[PDB]
Amino acid sequence: KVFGRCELAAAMKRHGLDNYRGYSLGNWVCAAKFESNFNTQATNRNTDGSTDYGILQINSRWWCNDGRTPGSRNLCNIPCSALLSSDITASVNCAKKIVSDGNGMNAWVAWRNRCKGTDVQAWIRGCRL
Ligand SMILES: [Cl-]
Ligand SMILES: [Cl-]
């Protein structure tokens, strides 16, 4: 599923991501656009043999199981296919665990390099939230 910008903002708000760990919803919309272009089915392979999955591009070396990242953790306790669903609940729940692990949203490179220090609220502007 390829989300609309205000559609995703609304679905993130429903799932408790607005102001979660002090991050306003713009930051979530922003890191979704530049990681996955709002496509829940985005996958990308990393150099080390791990894979990023879903609308936030969550990494198999630490958070999910794809059965092909030898010696990786499953700290969100989910198969990585579950992040590719049209229902973002699994992605949101894992993302709450990630952002709370100490390093904030800097875990997401594309948030660090393309959203942080920006007027992130522009990403929710015009939306009925
Ligand atoms: Cl915002
Ligand atoms: Cl980047």
From Swiss-Prot:
It is an enzyme of class 3 (hydrolase). Residues 1-129 form the C-type lysozyme domain. It comes from the Eukaryota. The active site is at 35, 52. CDD domains: LYZ_C. One of its GO terms (molecular function) is lysozyme activity. It catalyses: Hydrolysis of (1->4)-beta-linkages between N-acetylmuramic acid and N-acetyl-D-glucosamine residues in a peptidoglycan and between N-acetyl-D-glucosamine residues in chitodextrins. Its EC number is 3.2.1.17. Gene3D superfamilies: 1.10.530.10. GO terms for biological process: cell wall macromolecule catabolic process; defense response to bacterium; defense response to Gram-negative bacterium; defense response to Gram-positive bacterium; killing of cells of another organism. Substrate binds at residue 101. It is found in: Secreted. SMART domains: LYZ1. In the egg white and polymorphonuclear leukocytes. It holds the Pfam family Lys. Disulfide bonds join 6-127, 30-115, 64-80, 76-94. Monomer. Lysozyme C is capable of both hydrolysis and transglycosylation; it also shows a slight esterase activity. It acts rapidly on both peptide-substituted and unsubstituted peptidoglycan, and slowly on chitin oligosaccharides. Belongs to the glycosyl hydrolase 22 family. Lysozymes have primarily a bacteriolytic function; those in tissues and body fluids are associated with the monocyte-macrophage system and enhance the activity of immunoagents. Has bacteriolytic activity against M.luteus. This is Lysozyme C. The lineage of its organism: Eukaryota, Metazoa, Chordata, Craniata, Vertebrata. The gene is LYZ.
